[PDB]
């Protein structure tokens, strides 16, 4: 899983991250801020008909799946300083990313991930 | 509602106390938690004062004692009925027909209570994995000790200790395999990982494991099942990790259930019951059947239950062993009462009035036991128990992880953990170290009971001490009797002395261990067909 699209944004702006490989798996975006614990952000079912979001981003972020290009997007809007973090992606055999927005026990590698910074 | 500020000014840092009392004296919101929180602030300010200026302190102590009574007052002032939920927990495999029959008594007596049977949708194969680890280790130890198990003087403790070394080895191989699988780009389910490990390592057939897994899911769903993973029960990674280290590293489903029940009450409120509990017996019923002086109190409670099942057969094949042993006039007298009439047999819960600050708990032998609990959603005391559990696991994992991650067998890993606990410890909270020292043995050797001090009754007793004394994170301080029964689960509402309660599913005593070992030897030498 390759995470791409990150960069700077201004407070209030938008950004679209991409997670490139997934057809029969639920896919979740997660994030980790410097010095904070990882937290779930979004999840989308394999059909793409069901989604789930962290409370802090619900109604601001959306997630979609473009099966054809095996890639799930994270449409971020109304970016805030608290959204500053490295963003990682993962696929799940479980429905709706299991214990989302929490992480699987023991899972400590999520790929390279892509940094998002929202400042000043 | 204490002595007012002028009274304490006219009876005796200190300025903060007066306002802190003044804030509390004026504070007339209807939020019990805020009242308690303001009481707590005042107490710490008093304490600060006291230490730094070790004439004031005569009357500041008097206020301190008054504050302790105010806590009781706030708790007992506005009680209200608890939410009408009954929470049960069965994790790790298929729920049993016996457990379902016990839950059925509660439902039939309390149709207005919503029944939740919490399960782990990912973890139906945990008990199968534990069985495969334990049974394979039993054969290792029996064959290793073949020359000596034939000796009548053989110490059965030698068998349990040698078996533990194999158990520890095979638990570690599973968790290492789990760690590699969970770190794939596609996260598999826990049952995916166990299935794959059982098939490759223990020669389990994949289709039977899957057929058991799907069967467990269908049966629990048809029986009030609600999934702990999908219903956002866990909101803190730390608590999920504690649940997971018990579920996955140790195979201790009672410990895992200790976590789940606290989160269920925190999020929903209501009553938690272990699946071996039964509704209380209608009071006054068994005074007209007077009880012989040869049958003890605990036994007579058991005999009571055996009488109902004999004639009504609510639970099938319930034991009658204790009942049968006596006078047929008694049996006939019992037989007429039961046949003459469930609601006249069993007490209904109805309104269970509690403070929104508290949690109530069953008692056994004068000490709390968390097999039955009552709490409103989000109560302060439930959160204190949860904080106790996290604090205890923080200390355990600090000392256990270096031992467990070292490249060492069970005996040397145990010594590192044990030495980590004792070689540099302080005398304060000394008693807690002794109780958690056999942690790795819990479930697999007799008299290993660390769960009591981590996620079980010991966490509750310290939480109650926290609450009564307006503190947090107390370890080995215990309340006097009069403070403790403030939190007692009404005995009229609960039958604790059931058949299924007799056998613990996570621990065993020396007598059972000796009998089980002799059973292992008899089957080993005798062979099976
Ligand atoms: O495979 C299992 C085994 C047990 N349990 C759960 O564990 C609970 C406790 O089981 P039980 O066998 O009754 O254990 P106890 O012998 O009663 O011993 C303790 O079990 C827990 C350990 O702290 C707490 O209930 C209390 O301390 C105490 O009652 C059960 O009700 C279930 O909820 C499972 O979910 N799956
Ligand atoms: Mn029990």
How far apart are the C-alpha atoms of B488 and B491, rounded to whole Å? 8
* Ramachandran angles phi, psi of B107, nearest 5°: -60, -50
Number of H helices, E strands in chain B: 23, 9
- DSSP conformation class of B169: H
Q: Any idea what DSSP says for residue B521?
A: H
- Whether B231 lines ligand 1, by a CB cut-off of 6 Å, is no
Of B345, B375, B316, B362, the closest CA to residue B108 belongs to: B345
Cβ within 8 Å of residue B288, ≥6 positions away:
B337
Q: How far is the CA of B500 from the centre of ligand 2 (A)?
A: 7
CA distance linking residue B190 with residue B172, whole number of Å: 16
CA of residue B127 to ligand 2 center, whole Å: 17
Determine which helix (DSSP H) or strand (DSSP E) holds B186, and give its type and residue range.
strand B186-187
Looking at B349-505, list the stretches that DSSP marks H as alpha helix, in order from N- to C-terminal side.
380-405, 410-422, 430-436, 451-454, 457-468, 481-484, 499-502
In angstroms, the Cα distances linking B20 to B16, B37, B124, B264, B298 are 6, 11, 53, 35, 49
CA-closest candidate to residue B303, choices B343, B347, B274, B333: B333
Q: How far apart are CA B158 and CA B165, in angstroms?
A: 11
Distances in whole angstroms, Cα of residue B11 to Cα of each of B42, B58, B245: 17, 9, 55
Contact B160, B513 (CB under 8 A): yes
DSSP per residue, B406-449:
SS--HHHHHHHHHHHHHTT--STTHHHHHHHTTGGGTTTSTT--
As a whole number of angstroms, the distance between CA B501 and CA B346 comes to 18
Measured CA to CA, the distance from residue B76 to residue B71 in angstroms comes to 9
- Report helix, strand or coil for B527: coil
Whether B251 lines ligand 1, by a CB cut-off of 6 Å, is no
Rg over CA atoms, chain B: 26
* Number of helices followed by number of strands (H, E) in chain A: 0, 10
Edge-to-edge strands, sheet with A2-4:
A2-4, A15-20, A71-76, A61-66
Contact B164, B175 (CB under 8 A): no
In 3-state terms, what secondary structure has residue B318? coil
The rounded distance, in Å, linking the Cα atoms of B354 and B230 is: 29
Q: Are B216 and B194 in contact (CB under 8 A)?
A: no
d(CA B303, CA B347): 17
Verify whether the Cβ–Cβ distance A37 to B229 is below 8 Å: no
Q: How far is the CA of B232 from the centre of ligand 1 (A)?
A: 23
**Contact yes or no for B420/B395 (Cβ under 8 A):** no
The answer to whether the beta carbons of residues B310 and B525 sit under 8 Å apart is no
Residues of A in contact with B239 (CB under 8 A): none
* Spans of all domains in chain A: 2-118
For strand B80-81 and strand A114-118, is the pairing parallel, antiparallel, or unpaired? unpaired
Peptide bond into A101 cis (omega under 30): yes
CA angle B345, B351, B354 (to 5 degrees): 125
The CA distances from residue B342 to A18, B121, B153, B224, in Å, are 61, 34, 52, 22
Which among A93, A105, A108 has CB closest to B188? A93
In chain B, what is the straight-line distance between the N-terminal and C-terminal CA atoms, in Å? 76
For domain A2-118, give the CATH superfamily.
Immunoglobulins (2.60.40.10)
CA dihedral A76, A79, A82, A86 (to 10 degrees): 50
> A91 to chain B: nearest residue by CA?
B186
- d(CA B150, CA B221) in angstroms, rounded, equals 48
Instruction: Identify the residue among A99, A107, A108, A110 best suited for mutation to test binding to B, counting B beta carbons within 10 A and taking the highest.
Output: A99
Reading phi first (left if > 0) and then psi (alpha if -120 to 50, else beta), residue A19 is in beta
CA angle B170, B175, B176 (to 5 degrees): 95
β partners of residue A9: A118
The A residues from 43 to 102 touching B (CB cutoff 8 Å) are 90-96, 98-99, 102
The shortest CB-CB distance from B234 to any of A91, A102, A108 is to A102
Q: Is the CB of B174 under 6 A from ligand 1?
A: no
Instruction: Pick the atom of ligand 1 nearest to B505's CA.
Output: 12
Breaks (C-N over 2.5 A) in chain A follow: 21
Question: Quick one: residue B337, left, alpha or beta (phi over 0 = left, psi -120 to 50 = alpha)?
Answer: alpha
Q: Solved by what technique?
A: X-ray
Enumerate the β-bridge partners of residue A3.
A19
The alpha carbons of chain A give a radius of gyration, in whole angstroms, of 13
């Amino acid at each position: 899983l390759v995470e791409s699209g990150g960069g700077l944004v201004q407070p209030g702006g938008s950004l679209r991250l991409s997670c490139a490989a997934l057809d029969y798996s639920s896919i979740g975006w997660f994030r980790q801020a410097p010095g904070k614990e990882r937290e779930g952000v979004s999840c989308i079912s394999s059909s793409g008909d069901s989604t789930k979001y962290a409370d802090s981003v619900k109604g601001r972020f959306t997630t979609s799946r473009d099966n054809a290009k095996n890639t799930v997007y994270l449409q971020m809007n109304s970016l805030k300083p608290d959204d500053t973090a490295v963003y990682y992606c993962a696929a799940f055999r479980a429905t709706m990313c299991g214990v989302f927005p929490l992480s699987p026990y023991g899972k400590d590698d999520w790929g390279k991930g892509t940094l998002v910074t929202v400042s000043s | 509602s204490l002595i007012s500020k002028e009274e304490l000014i006219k009876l005796a840092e200190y300025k903060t106390i007066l306002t802190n009392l003044d804030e509390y004296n004026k504070l007339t919101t209807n939020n019990n938690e805020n009242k308690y929180l303001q009481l707590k602030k005042l107490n710490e300010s008093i304490d600060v004062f006291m230490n730094k200026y070790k004439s004031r302190n005569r009357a500041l102590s008097n206020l301190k004692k008054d504050i302790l009574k105010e806590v009781i007052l706030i708790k007992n002032s506005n009680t209200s009925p608890v939410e009408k939920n009954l929470h049960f927990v069965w994790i790790g495999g298929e729920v049993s027909d016996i457990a379902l029959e016990y839950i059925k008594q509660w439902a039939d007596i309390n149709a207005e209570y919503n029944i939740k049977l919490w399960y782990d949708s990912e973890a139906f194969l945990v008990n199968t994995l534990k069985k495969a680890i334990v049974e394979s280790s039993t054969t290792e130890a029996l064959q290793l000790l073949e020359e000596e198990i034939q000796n009548p003087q053989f110490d059965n403790m030698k068998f349990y200790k040698k078996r533990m070394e194999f158990i520890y080895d095979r638990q570690k191989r599973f968790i290492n395999y789990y760690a590699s699988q969970i770190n794939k780009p596609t996260v598999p389910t826990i049952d995916d990982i166990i299935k794959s490990h059982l098939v490759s390592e223990y020669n389990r057939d994949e289709t039977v494991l899957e057929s058991y897994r799907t069967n467990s899911l269908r049966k629990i769903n048809s029986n009030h099942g609600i999934d702990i993973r999908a219903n956002s029960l866990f909101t803190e990674q730390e608590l999920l990790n504690i649940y997971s280290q018990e579920l996955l590293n140790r195979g201790n489903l009672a410990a895992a259930s200790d976590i789940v029940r606290l989160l269920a009450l925190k999020n929903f409120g209501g009553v938690y019951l272990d699946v071996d509990m039964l509704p209380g017996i209608h009071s006054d019923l068994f005074k007209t059947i007077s009880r012989p002086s040869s049958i003890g109190l605990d036994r007579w409670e058991m005999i009571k239950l055996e009488a109902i099942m004999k004639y009504k057969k609510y639970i099938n094949n319930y034991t009658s062993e204790n009942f049968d042993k006596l006078d047929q006039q008694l049996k006939d007298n019992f037989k007429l009462i039961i046949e003459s009439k469930k609601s006249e047999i069993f007490s209904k819960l109805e309104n269970l009035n509690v403070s929104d600050l508290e949690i109530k708990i069953a008692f056994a032998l004068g000490s709390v036991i968390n097999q039955a609990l009552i709490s409103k959603q989000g109560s302060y005391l439930t959160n204190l128990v949860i904080e106790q559990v996290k604090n205890r696991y923080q200390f355990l994992n600090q000392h256990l992880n270096p031992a467990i991650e070292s490249d060492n067998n069970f005996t040397d890993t145990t010594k590192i953990f044990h030495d980590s606990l004792f070689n540099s410890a302080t005398a304060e909270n000394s008693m807690f170290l002794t109780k958690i020292a056999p942690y790795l043995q819990v479930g697999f050797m007799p008299e290993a009971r660390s769960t009591i001090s981590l996620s079980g009754p010991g966490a509750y007793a310290s939480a109650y001490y926290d609450f009564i004394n307006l503190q947090e994170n107390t370890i080995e301080k215990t309340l006097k009797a009069s403070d403790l029964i403030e939190f007692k689960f009404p005995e009229n509402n609960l039958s604790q002395l059931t058949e299924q309660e007799i056998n613990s599913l996570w621990s065993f005593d020396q007598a059972s261990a000796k009998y089980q070992f002799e059973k292992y030897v008899r089957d080993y030498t005798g062979g099976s067909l």
